[model samples]
Target: PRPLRLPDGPPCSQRSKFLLMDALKLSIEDPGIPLYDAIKCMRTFFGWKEPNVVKPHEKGINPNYLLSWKQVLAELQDIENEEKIPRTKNMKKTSQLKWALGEELRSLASWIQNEFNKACELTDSSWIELDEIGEDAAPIEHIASMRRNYFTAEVSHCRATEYIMKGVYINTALLNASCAAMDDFQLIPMISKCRTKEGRRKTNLYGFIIKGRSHLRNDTDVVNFVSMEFSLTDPRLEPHKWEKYCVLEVGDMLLRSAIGHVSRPMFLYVRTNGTSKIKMKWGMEMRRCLLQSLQQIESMIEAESSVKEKDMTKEFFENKESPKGVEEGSIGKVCRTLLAKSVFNSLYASPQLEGFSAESRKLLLIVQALRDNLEFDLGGLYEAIEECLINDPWVLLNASWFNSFLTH
Candidate 1:
């Protein structure tokens, strides 16, 4: 008999290891159940760890390539103009795309570096706590070192995996065909039942369900942007625990935005800790969150580095080519918040009921009011409006409730 060499995957069979941790919780538990590992187990179970397959391109290209050299060249020109980087007039097409993609990545890497100074400082603040801290070297140096190490490697190889999928990359042509076939059907089966040995290899489509809405978009820049954003924000891409739920939510929102933009709106039934599913469209409200995340990152730099930054949310307050001053008060925040929801109601929900014409008509008044005073804050009323939307999205579509919340 010969020894077998099997690939190691996630620890599903290692039940006893977890059981032993649980036993420690119970016996030496002092007649109590510690939620330390309970919370750990809960997140571990819900975490997205699945198989993905990237097959060989039948056209003798790479299956993982979303943008061809031609597409990459166009995008390169756009970035070059904006960033004032030198034009690539003379380079092999093979390396040009790599250089173009590399340049953009280097730009992002440097951006991360610039912002990380503040992120690093905030990490040391008393108000902010990180589990792991105070290493032998500054965190900035570590980040810089990693950047050097990464760029030194075939950086394109590192970035290609992100633009493709978060999984195994096999260059085998047969397995590639099998994976592509399974992808056509949108199923993440353990193995494709092709009548060949290669079918036994694990396979998954790019971005999984996220790809359903991804490939449809004609804009290559948007597609790559969404993928890179997801890659940067998703902690699940790394071997880690899910403590930063806010970051996780942002990543989910980004993925959802891509899917939501398609004609038939897709709804995700999320049930964990609580049971609730809300209808989400690729509307201003969704885009606002994305913008806010961007602002927050910039603000992080401002806070840490003592650099005064302008509102990245500046364009958000603009209406019909007129730019309004960005407001910082709670009153302004409330109006800004309602502005998104009000437009959403007018666009999607309010139209469902012309019978309630008064209610529907009042939304426009509210929208105008919101736009005019977007810089003012509504204090407690803001929270109430949010609660109403959370419980029942169409609550504001009512004339009485709409006036009632605003009146308060």
Candidate 2:
């Protein structure tokens, strides 16, 4: 077979002629490598590791949830259009919404308090000195017969606190989400959760249980030895053996993660390189790759499952909704206001937020008062308020500010 002839074109312009002649004179070269293989090699050379693949969490999938490229484009366009409205109108709506949300969030805060009180009540009788509880209680004495059993239960309580603290942190996510929506709100509940009070109480109760067991055995050193061993292995317990000592530690971790996640997009936007064509090219490429991967995963899951694509998309990705009781093009501002209010409320109520100092707490109080007054002026704030009523306060908080606050 005759080789196909490549097309030739006339070039008159100085720049065109030089480029055309170079193209004509150059030999068509192939490195004898498949394009895919070459690209893979380049990726590897650039230290790109293959991602660890995992299965979808659910066993079944749904096709109705599948979203097309056109749908995604439309969604992006919607977001853009929504973002282009005047900030003042949006802000006004947001303020209104915060007031309504405030009521519901306050209710949740009360519910949490009630639950804590109930837990306290249940454990009230069991609360006694460590030495007395174990020695006096026959059931406990039987279990405390062995040193390992006694220590294990005590250490297990410590470990349980660790796990429970994780749940507490998860619960705090709701508060953080709320704070992101509101500008001003009381944050005592959120701050209290940060204290590790529950964990400490639990740990102390366990410790006393251990002491009582040791006393029953008439060996004080056994309890001492257990405490010493735990201390030696975990030097973090040096200053305080109670869980309260670790409250700030865990709170700091959660706070950092929450803030980072919320502010990531802004950080990316600001930190994007203005110089270095290669870096820009790499960023663009990475973005494309990520979008492609997301689409593929979405499609794959949809195809393998039986769920509706709309539900799946809404569940996993951001979606647009018409702002209730507001003029068109005002949703973003409303969203922002609501988010700010939510963030404030969550932070204010967070039992985990510590070290506010008198000055910081005072500053926070001022902000809250300002926000509360702003609600009267900002009617549009009702959008967020309505949302708080419809959804969990935590959900509203996370949706409103987690990405913007953490990532930025």
Candidate 3:
């Protein structure tokens, strides 16, 4: 209707509009493709269209919210204080019996998942690519809820497109439910349905199959994370695709996580063809949040106005202003050659991180080791011992990929 909206940041440069131009042309061939419309919306966004922060909050209590975006990252960070312990049972860390009985706990489940994504950039890689998995802007075709219509939160965490691997476009979500104290049973689909290739038969569409074993400890509330891996039969993606459940967790707080494929590399970042339009990465908000972030980007543009001093500078308008500051040259693009599989960035922390495990503090040396030594690139082998933390976004705090920015 309103030319569907893209994520939090707008296309600040024409270069960022490059892929959308191709996506738009494809939509022209098959206008019916949801992807076509999705790209088309992206086109309008890149062209400097509407649907910016002028719009009010669609939900969330603070309709009068002074800040823009789908959700505020800084505010959520405030909710967590190291001293505030989770109300739980014995050493197992299970939620108290009466806790799950309220709607607050249900919403808290969603909030916890949101915070975890923010604290750890879960979906930034894919968002770094096409900018959208087409879910936040478009209502998906539909599906089956795994269980009671309660306490389940669907988080689109990973989308593989702009990734250097040059493979299929797979998406994964953090499917969680904060209902009742439970076991691995919580790992089962709370919202169960498979999205299949439209007219294709014998194809799996969003099936919650097992690629890895489920680990249920005394503390698990709902499945914490659904780190998915598509089981492609071979290097060439043809026949169809399958799911290899990668990682799952017990509690929503994300104190701990489990992975399949035993000890394997985790989390990877993509360095797109450099452009300021590329914007930010990882759990860096998408969809409704972009307008506000775009505003943030816009100010930098205005500040760096290349216009002649005498020229009348422009005022900010969602429908008109150009995001001139989008990086056009090499922005975050590191790793020109394929060297190693990515490892998770969770192990690293922002310099400002609080309440650390002695184990976490120990890994700082590796971060410093790589930071201090130019020849220290181990090509992900270092991850075998431990993963790095993605502390600052501008540092982008990525685990792998040769981003010269983090090196600085």
TM-score of each: 0.20, 0.15, 0.24
lDDT of 1: 0.24
lDDT of 2 by residue, 313-356 (tens): 33322222421333323322322232223222322332222222
Between prediction 2 and prediction 3, which has the larger TM-score? 3
Residue lDDT tens for model 1, 1-408: 011111233211110000100010101111111122222222222223221212222232231233332332244345445644332122223432332222200001122222212121211101101211122353455433332232222111212111111211211211232224322211111111111122232221111111111132221122111111112222233211211111112111122245574221111111011000121112212323323433443343345334323332322322112324434333224332333333233223423233344433444465668767886433433333333332111332243334544454
> Best TM-score goes to which candidate?
3
lDDT of 2: 0.23
> Deviation in angstroms for 133 in model 3?
15
Checking candidate 1 for backbone clashes, the offending pairs are 52-204, 53-204, 55-176, 330-377, 331-376, 331-377, 331-378, 332-375, 332-376, 332-377
Worst 10 residues of 1 by lDDT: 15-24
Clashes of 2: 84
Error of 2 at 193 (Å): 9.6
Show how many residue pairs clash in every candidate, following the order shown. Answer: 10, 84, 23
Give me the candidate number with maximum lDDT: 1
- The candidates, ranked best first by lDDT, are 1, 2, 3
Once fitted onto the true fold, the runs of candidate 1 whose alpha carbons sit more than 4 angstroms away are 1-332, 339-350, 353-359, 362-400, 403-408
**Global lDDT scores for all candidate models:** 0.24, 0.23, 0.21
Cα RMSD to native, each candidate? 25.0, 33.2, 23.6
